[PDB]
């Protein structure tokens, strides 16, 4: 009975996996076989959508999240985003799946058969929590790994077919990136813009070739990172700043996870160019738009000017001023003002929307794109009866924006309560009172009172 | 020691009447801006045009509000998520008319209040207490910020926003109700049973205990002088309020462990509440309550309304009056 | 030594016996097409 | 030792599931009421008194299944089955909406039986009747918002029907006709809700966080006896920690479990109040000074107007079909519509 | 303590319980299935069939508008269904 | 009420000849107009032009007359404008245009009627809800 009951470990079975804190072999394990199901996971639901997946209907009508990634690196997709071979996704698919099944018989022979602490059995693998080298080499080695896997981003978009850009000219293409941005004035610049409207901070990222750039500075960083921790300790400033458990560091990856998932959240909800919006759907923003170009298209057909066209309130109906002046669209759209897409861009001028270019140079890829767009607005019920909440059944339909945002919120925010929560525990538990107060030397009782 | 030490040893006393703490030091001055301008704009704030539709709405109670009708209001739809401090206006009057003090408001506030989660940690770690009141403070916490930040950041705008008032209050939930169905999404009908829940719960927990307190006193003064602060007796005979309300349901329907009892007054209402806020948190991405709009047909066809369609013809009462002046465009899309 | 019908027995009836019961009548309607 | 000796001692003999007098009262009409609500939300429709469908076997799932209240036409009728309207008739009983009243009646009377075995258990182990007293609130809702309401109204047809989807309505009904957001009954209501729930959270997560360390594992939970004399958390580092976080702290533990009560409690009967004026459309609707000047004064608006004018869109839009017996007709062109939508 | 009667994890785990409940459980079930599949609980209750709702070609409600003709007016709406 | 084949029987010309669909046909042309035509249609309306609805009453008025079989069919291979103007394949899905309009590669003949049957009997069931937007939900 090592651990694996109340009595000897301490902790109750519903706390039962606490009882791993001190068995390195069991707790590697425990995370292997987690690994193995992630892994599944990515590869049971890739098939899953191949399976569901009708290349006649757009991606977002199908509720696919996973199949959109991989188009979006560049495999199985032509121009306009047009699914043109769907082999990539099966073999994605399976050799996740297939993965997961070594990844499980690691964890399962970890956790069970093998032995419960590496200490004994190897000084490289075996570790103690406050062995503040050891673990920062651990670190070290990871960090590696994750800049060698940002690279690989690299690797795929300079020298392996490109990703899908959707600012490409003609609708949108895969194109191979050869001058990613190096400049460290853009790259860093997105880190200081602030994250708010009309700026974004790290979401306003509009251009591959940023993209590729970045991660060409993140691996690099990363691999740095991993070379000073694993030849470093940390100095005296952080050894007297922080906890030094495994608990600590758990509630230190929790609150970093935490932020990961409010970040993606609105990532997935404002950028149109890592998450094509001929995969994604239109963003909320780019629906709202599209609405208003939808009608200025209409009424202009019918002879309507549309640059005088004086609305109810005394604002233009269809165009108006944003504060700083650009020309944008009139109506409850002008908060989204800020959208930039590919369908649109090309009625902007220095001023913004340009008159003549709205009389004169809309497509019908444009009326096209922006119908389209604006019938696909990220609204919808629980049940995916897609539109607004009083709209009857009828259009099947959530987009996977929201089914992307709504789950990253929920996922972010108890992760943030896990890092108060584990947190919390681990100061205490260091300082000697997560289990209650001492009877016999409470400290308020030895405190002079407040009044 | 040196000047520095000093004041580190200040502002974690806990000698201090209230708390100051690093926590603290943020969160004094962000809720001393937040207070200062709330209570001068809700009394003499001229009238805001919540709405970019130079529609300005009047909220304070010089402009002829009284308690109940008075607010700030948001800013306005122009500005959508735009940052808005005071040195980006040309002048207070253009500040306040776009509804400035909102923004200053609600940022200073959601920071400050942030501060106090973290104080509440602070605190209980000098003390040497454990750690989690201050988890249970996340449930308001977080359904503030899902009404003053991440609902605004779905939409696009801090004019959708909840307004700081009695009246911005109800109109925040009504046109919440007819562009989510919030009533009809399980999220809030768990922040219900949370607090329904949580008022059952306090008035039973309430009620069992004082109907179980020790005899201490006589007849002509409150039963409260048989409890002395500090005493290390308990006032009230739990095994005796086990035996009524055991027998009132029965005997495993109730509960014999004091830490089992108060931890599930603790984590009832802090996990609904979490819920509710969830369920505001995903609505502002447009994820909305259950659609049953015509899903009673009969053999002919003809739609068979249930309950879910009336709910649906009062939403649309509210969808269709809603910011009657705002919309040029049919779909109502944020 | 145990009683086996007791108020207790009557009590548990009372609710399952009608519970398995309205269970089957839903779980049948599941296949009424209109 | 009479035969009323002999049934009160077996009335009151210790079992798994106690009885007492009171059990004579409350099984039978708690059975009745839960069983009637079970039984008609799976079998039975709305159909003629409502044109709702309403049951499961009509196809509505959990969330839109009711016993909905009769129709207008019946008035108050207490819809006995041998009464006048069902003639002893059972189907036409369901018909006609008499599992509504079934279930509202004797609900009612398994209340009054549940308070009663609350006196009756709490007078037999020699505890004060607090939980009783709390049991009030309960029933002070139940009786003005299923009983007393509807008997102000014109029929029964306006109460609240049994269902999740239904209630909602009542909820949207309240708002667009009673104006009841803006009654200070409600609002007090409100506050004894929130802050019972406030309360709930605070104290349970006080004590959790002020124990004292009675065992040596980590689960804190098997380190009480109920039989242990001393209290199990400090009341003397929770009431340090509150004053310096809050101001404030309880200091007196009786005092504290009674605010517990009285909290929650007060808040339902303010809100009792307040529905029994809406029984008599004593509603407070309106801010008069504010209506004088919106009238006076196109430029004035607040939250209040924008609120009225959710109100009338409400009541047009869902009148015709929410009461189908008053046989509405609303042509299009007078709907109160904002622009576009 | 105990009240005396037989705690409930005696009787689920005894094989006298599961020989006694294999079948009146499943009994049950079936009857309640039945209940519905024969068409019987639409003529106890009265609720409609997905077919008699409305006549062939009438929109309107059937909706009782008298308190002592009540009875009287569902059954001559249900005779117009014919 | 039921579904009859008096309902299910519906213009196939203009020139007054009918044809009766079945029961498979109309819940066809319902599962295809959801797929194919819903997001711009849904309930006989048109959200990109509110304007233009699918009732029977619109359809007669087309140029050409639209209030039937082939007459739909017609329109969902080469849809013209309300007065036969103009030809619209370029932003009105069709077989026309399925190169740009994906949804329409996979239909036949047989789907196009199904619809065009959908279309055309949904009226006679749900009356003025058809076509007549949020006032009758
Ligand atoms: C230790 C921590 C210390 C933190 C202290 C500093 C805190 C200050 C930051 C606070 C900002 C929060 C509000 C952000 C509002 C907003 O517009 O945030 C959204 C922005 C994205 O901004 C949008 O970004 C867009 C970028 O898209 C643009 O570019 C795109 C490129 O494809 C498209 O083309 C698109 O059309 C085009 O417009 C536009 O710029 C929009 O106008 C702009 O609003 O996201 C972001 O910056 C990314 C991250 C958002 C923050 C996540 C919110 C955190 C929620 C708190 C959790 C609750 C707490 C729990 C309680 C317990
Ligand atoms: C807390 C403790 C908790 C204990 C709860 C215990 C629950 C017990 C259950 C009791 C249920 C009582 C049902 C009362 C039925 C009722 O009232 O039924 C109503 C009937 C009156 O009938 C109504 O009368 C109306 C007025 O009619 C009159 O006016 C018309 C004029 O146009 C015609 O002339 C008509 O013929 C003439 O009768 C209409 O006809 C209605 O349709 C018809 O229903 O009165 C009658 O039965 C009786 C009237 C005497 C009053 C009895 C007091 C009960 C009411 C208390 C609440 C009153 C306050 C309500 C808020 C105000
Ligand atoms: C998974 C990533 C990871 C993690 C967990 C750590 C963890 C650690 N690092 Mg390492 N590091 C990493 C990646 C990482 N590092 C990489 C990629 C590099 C290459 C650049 C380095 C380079 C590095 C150096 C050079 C040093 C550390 C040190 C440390 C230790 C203390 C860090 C500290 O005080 O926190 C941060 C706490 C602070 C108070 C720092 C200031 C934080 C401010 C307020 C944040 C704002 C500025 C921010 C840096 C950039 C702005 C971005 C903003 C817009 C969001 C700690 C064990 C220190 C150490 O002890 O080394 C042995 C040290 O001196 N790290
Ligand atoms: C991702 C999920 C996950 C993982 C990986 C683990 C992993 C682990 N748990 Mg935790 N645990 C979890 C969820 C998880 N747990 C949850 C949700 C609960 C709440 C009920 C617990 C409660 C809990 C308690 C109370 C305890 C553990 C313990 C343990 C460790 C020893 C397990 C053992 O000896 O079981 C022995 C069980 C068996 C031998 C039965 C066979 C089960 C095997 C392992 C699963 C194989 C199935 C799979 C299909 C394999 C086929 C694939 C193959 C082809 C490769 C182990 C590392 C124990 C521990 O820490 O020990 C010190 C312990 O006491 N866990
Ligand atoms: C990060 C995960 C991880 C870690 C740290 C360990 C660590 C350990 N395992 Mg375990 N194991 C794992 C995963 C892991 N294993 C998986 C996935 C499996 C299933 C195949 C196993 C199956 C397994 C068995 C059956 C045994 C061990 C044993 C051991 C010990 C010695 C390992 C050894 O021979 O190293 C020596 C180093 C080498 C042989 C160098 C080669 C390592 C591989 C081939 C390099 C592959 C790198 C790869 C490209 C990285 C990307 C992977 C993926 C993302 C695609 C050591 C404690 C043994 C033990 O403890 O004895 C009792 C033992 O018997 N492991
Ligand atoms: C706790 C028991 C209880 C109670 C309080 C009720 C109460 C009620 N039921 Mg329910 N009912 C019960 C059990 C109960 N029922 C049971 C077990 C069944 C299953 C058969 C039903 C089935 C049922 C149906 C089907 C209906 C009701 C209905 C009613 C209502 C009207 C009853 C009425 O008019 O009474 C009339 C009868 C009396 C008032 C009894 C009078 C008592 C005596 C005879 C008076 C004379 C005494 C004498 C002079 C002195 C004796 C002194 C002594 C020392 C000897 C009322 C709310 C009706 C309803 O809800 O309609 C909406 C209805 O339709 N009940
Ligand atoms: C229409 C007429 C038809 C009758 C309908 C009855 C409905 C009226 C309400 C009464 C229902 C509740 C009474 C339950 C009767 C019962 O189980 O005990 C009756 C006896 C005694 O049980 C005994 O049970 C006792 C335990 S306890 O009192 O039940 O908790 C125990 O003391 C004793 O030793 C044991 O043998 O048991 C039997 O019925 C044997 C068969
Ligand atoms: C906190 C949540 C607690 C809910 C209970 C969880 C029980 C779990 C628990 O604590 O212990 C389980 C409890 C004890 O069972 P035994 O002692 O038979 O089991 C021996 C066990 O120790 C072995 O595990 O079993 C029951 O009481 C089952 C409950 C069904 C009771 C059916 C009776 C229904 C009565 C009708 C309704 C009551 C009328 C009320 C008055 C109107
Ligand atoms: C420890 C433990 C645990 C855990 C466990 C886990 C976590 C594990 C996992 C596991 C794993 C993770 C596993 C894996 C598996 C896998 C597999 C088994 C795979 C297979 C595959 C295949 C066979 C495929 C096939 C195919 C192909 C190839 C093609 C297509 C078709 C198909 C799909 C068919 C628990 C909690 C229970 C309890 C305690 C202890
Ligand atoms: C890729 C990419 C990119 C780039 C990016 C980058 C380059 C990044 C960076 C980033 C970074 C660079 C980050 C950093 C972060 C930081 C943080 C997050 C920090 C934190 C800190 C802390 C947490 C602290 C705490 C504390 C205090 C405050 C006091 C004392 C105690 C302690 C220490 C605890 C871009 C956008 C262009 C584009 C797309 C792609
Ligand atoms: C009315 C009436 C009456 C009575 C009746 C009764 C008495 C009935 C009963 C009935 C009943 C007594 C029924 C019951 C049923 C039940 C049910 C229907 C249940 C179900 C449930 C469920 C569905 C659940 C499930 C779940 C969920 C959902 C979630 C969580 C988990 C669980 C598993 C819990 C008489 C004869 C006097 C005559 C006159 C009229
Ligand atoms: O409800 Mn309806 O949707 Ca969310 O925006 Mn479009 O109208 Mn307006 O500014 Mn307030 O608010
Ligand atoms: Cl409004
Ligand atoms: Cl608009
Ligand atoms: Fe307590």
């Known amino acids: ?255 970093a996870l935490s932020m990961m998932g409010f970040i993606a959240t609105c990532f997935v909800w404002f950028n149109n160019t890592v998450y094509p919006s001929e995969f994604y759907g239109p963003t909320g923003p780019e629906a709202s738009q599209a609405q208003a170009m939808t009608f200025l298209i209409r009424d202009q057909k019918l002879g309507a000017n549309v640059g005088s066209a004086q ?84 259009v099947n339909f959530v987009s996977p924006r929201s089914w992307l945002a709504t789950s990253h919120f929920v996922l972010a925010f108890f992760f943030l309560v896990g890092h108060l929560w584990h947190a919390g525990r681990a100061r205490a538990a260091a300082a000697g009172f997560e289990k209650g107060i001492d009877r016999e030397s409470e400290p308020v009782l030895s405190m002079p009172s407040l009044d | 020691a040196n000047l520095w030490e000093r004041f580190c040893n200040w502002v974690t006393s806990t000698d201090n ?117 201050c988890v249970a403070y996340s449930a308001p916490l977080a359904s503030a910020f899902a009404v003053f930040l991440i609902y605004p950041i779905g939409q696009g705008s801090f004019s959708d926003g909840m307004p700081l008032g009695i009246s911005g209050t109800f109109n925040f939930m009504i046109v919440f109700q007819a562009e989510h169905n919030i009533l009809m999404h399980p999220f809030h009908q768990l922040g219900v049973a949370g607090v329904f829940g949580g008022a059952l719960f306090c008035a039973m927990h309430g009620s069992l205990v004082t109907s179980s307190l020790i005899r201490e006193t006589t007849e002509t003064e409150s039963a409260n002088y048989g409890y002395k602060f500090g005493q290390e007796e308990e006032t009230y005979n739990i095994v005796a309020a086990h035996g009524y309300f055991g027998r009132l349901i029965f005997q495993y329907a109730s509960f ?38 015509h ?23 509210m969808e269709v009056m809603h910011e009657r002046n705002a919309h040029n465009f049919p779909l109502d899309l944020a | 030594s145990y009683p086996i019908f007791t108020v207790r027995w009557v009590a548990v009836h009372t609710l399952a016996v009608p519970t398995i019961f309205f269970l089957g009548a839903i779980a049948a309607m599941q296949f009424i097409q209109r | 030792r009479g035969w009323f000796d002999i049934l ?76 006048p309207e069902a003639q002893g008739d059972f189907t036409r009983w369901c018909q006609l909406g008499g599992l509504w009243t079934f279930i509202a009646l004797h ?77 200070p009954f409600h609002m007090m209501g409100v506050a004894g809700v929130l802050g019972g729930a406030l309360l709930c959270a605070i104290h349970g997560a006080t004590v959790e966080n002020t124990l004292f360390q009675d065992g040596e594992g980590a689960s804190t939970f098997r380190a009480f006896n109920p039989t242990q004399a001393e209290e199990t958390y400090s009341m003397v580092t929770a009431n340090r920690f509150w004053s310096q976080i809050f101001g404030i702290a309880f200091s007196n533990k009786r005092w504290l479990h009674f605010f517990m009560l009285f909290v929650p409690v007060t808040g339902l009967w303010m809100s009792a109040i307040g529905v029994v004026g809406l029984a008599l459309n004593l509603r407070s609707y309106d801010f008069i000074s504010q209506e004088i000047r919106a009238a006076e004064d196109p430029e004035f608006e607040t939250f209040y107007t924008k609120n009225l004018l959710l109100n009338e869109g409400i009541r047009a839009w869902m009148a015709p079909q929410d009461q189908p017996h008053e046989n509405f007709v609303f042509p299009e062109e007078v709907l109160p519509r904002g622009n576009a939508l | 303590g105990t009240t005396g009667e037989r705690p409930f994890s005696d009787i689920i785990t005894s094989v006298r319980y599961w020989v006694i409940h294999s079948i009146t459980i499943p009994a049950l079930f079936i009857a309640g299935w039945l209940f519905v599949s024969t068409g019987l609980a639409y003529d106890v209750f009265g609720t409609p069939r997905p077919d008699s709702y409305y006549a062939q070609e009438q929109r309107s409600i059937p909706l009782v508008t008298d308190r002592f003709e009540a009875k009287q007016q569902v059954e001559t709406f249900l005779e117009q269904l014919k | 009420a039921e579904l009859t084949p008096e309902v299910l029987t519906v213009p196939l010309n203009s020139e007054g000849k009918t044809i009766t ?117």
Not at chain 1, 341 to 347: A, D, I, K, M, V
């Open chain 2, 256 to 293: 014999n462990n004091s830490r089992s009892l108060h931890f599930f007054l603790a984590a009832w209402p802090v996990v609904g509440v979490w819920f509710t806020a969830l369920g505001i948190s995903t609505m502002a991405f447009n994820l909305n309550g259950f659609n049953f709009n």
């Open chain 1, 1 to 255: 009975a090592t651990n694996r009951d109340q009595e000897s470990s301490g902790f109750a079975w519903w706390a039962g996996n606490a009882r791993l804190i001190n068995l390195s072999g069991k707790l590697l394990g425990a995370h292997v076989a987690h690994a193995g199901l992630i892994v599944f996971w990515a590869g049971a639901m890739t098939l899953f959508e191949l399976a569901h997946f009708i290349p006649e209907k757009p991606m977002y009508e199908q509720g696919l999240i996973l199949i959109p990634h991989i188009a979006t690196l560049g495999w199985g997709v032509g121009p306009g985003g047009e699914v043109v071979d769907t082999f990539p996704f099966f073999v994605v698919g399976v050799v996740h799946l297939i993965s997961s099944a070594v990844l499980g018989f690691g964890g399962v022979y970890h956790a069970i058969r093998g032995p419960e602490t590496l200490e004994e059995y190897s000084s490289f693998f075996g570790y103690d929590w406050k062995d503040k080298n050891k673990m920062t080499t651990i670190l070290g080695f990871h960090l590696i790994v994750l800049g060698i896997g940002a690279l690989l981003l690299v690797a795929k978009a300079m020298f392996f077919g490109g990703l899908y850009d959707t600012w490409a000219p003609g609708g949108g293409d895969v194109r191979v990136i050869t001058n990613p941005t190096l400049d460290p004035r853009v790259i860093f610049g997105y880190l200081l813009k602030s994250p708010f409207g009309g700026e974004g901070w790290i979401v306003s990222v509009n251009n591959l070739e940023d993209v590729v750039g970045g991660h060409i500075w993140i691996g690099l960083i990363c691999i740095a990172g991993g070379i000073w921790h694993i030849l470093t300790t940390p100095f005296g400033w952080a050894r007297r700043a922080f906890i030094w458990s495994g608990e600590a560091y758990l509630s230190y990856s929790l609150g």
């Open chain 2, 17 to 133: 009447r209230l708390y100051v703490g690093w926590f603290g030091v943020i969160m004094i001055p962000t809720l001393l801006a937040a207070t200062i301008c709330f209570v001068i704009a809700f009394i003499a704030a001229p009238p805001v045009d919540i709405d970019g539709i130079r529609e300005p709405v009047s909220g304070s109670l010089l402009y002829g509000n009284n308690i109940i009708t008075g607010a700030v209001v948001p800013s306005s739809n122009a500005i959508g998520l735009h940052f808005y401090p005071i040195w980006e206006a040309a002048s207070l009057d253009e500040w306040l008319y776009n509804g400035g003090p909102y923004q200053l408001i609600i940022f200073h506030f959601l920071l400050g209040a942030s501060c106090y989660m973290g104080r509440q940690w602070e605190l209980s770690y000098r003390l040497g207490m454990r750690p989690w009141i």
């Open chain 1, 311 to 394: 609305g109810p309130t005394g604002l233009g109906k269809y165009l108006m001023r944003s504060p700083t002046g650009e020309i944008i669209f009139g109506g409850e759209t002008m908060r989204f003002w800020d959208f930039r897409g590919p369908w649109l861009e090309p009625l902007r001028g220095p001023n913004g929307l340009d008159l003549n270019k709205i009389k004169n140079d809309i497509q019908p890829w444009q009326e096209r794109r922006a119908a389209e767009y604006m019938t696909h607005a990220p609204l919808g019920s629980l049940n995916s009866v897609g539109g607004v909440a009083t709209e009857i059944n009828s």
């Open chain 6, 21 to 137: 669909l079945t029961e498979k046909q109309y819940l066809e042309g319902k599962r295809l107009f959801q797929y194919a035509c819903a997001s711009c249609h849904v309930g006989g309306i048109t959200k990109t032009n509110p304007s233009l609805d699918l009732r029977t009453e619109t359809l007669a008025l087309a140029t050409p007359p639209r209030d039937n079989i082939e007459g739909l069919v017609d329109y969902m291979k080469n849809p013209t404008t309300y007065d036969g103007e103009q030809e619209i394949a370029e932003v009105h899905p069709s077989l026309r245009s399925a190169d740009i309009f994906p949804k329409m590669r996979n239909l036949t003949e047989k789907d196009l009627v199904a619809i065009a049957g959908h279309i055309l009997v949904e009226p006679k069931i749900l009356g003025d809800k058809w076509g007549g937007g949020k006032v009758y939900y």
């Open chain 4, 107 to 183: 609900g009612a009377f398994g209340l009054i039986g549940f308070m009663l075995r609350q006196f009756e258990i709490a007078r037999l182990v020699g505890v004060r009747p607090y939980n009783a007293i709390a049991f009030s609130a309960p029933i002070a809702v139940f009786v003005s918002v299923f009983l007393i309401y509807p008997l102000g109204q014109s029929s029964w047809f306006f109460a609240p029907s049994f269902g999740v989807a239904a209630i909602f309505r009542f909820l949207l009904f309240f708002q667009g006709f009673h104006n009841w957001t803006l009654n």
């Open chain 4, 8 to 83: 009160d001692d077996w009335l009151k003999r210790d079992r798994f599931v106690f009885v007492g007098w009171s059990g004579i009262l409350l099984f039978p009409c708690a059975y009745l009421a839960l069983g009637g609500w079970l039984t008609g939300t799976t079998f039975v429709t709305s159909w003629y008194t409502h044109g709702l469908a309403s049951s499961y076997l009509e196809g509505c799932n959990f969330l839109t299944v009711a016993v909905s209240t009769p129709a207008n036409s019946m008035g108050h009728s207490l819809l006995l089955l041998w009464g």
């Open chain 2, 295 to 317: 899903s009673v047909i009969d053999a002919k066809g003809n739609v068979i309304n249930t309950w879910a369609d009336i709910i649906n013809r009062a939403n649309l009462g």
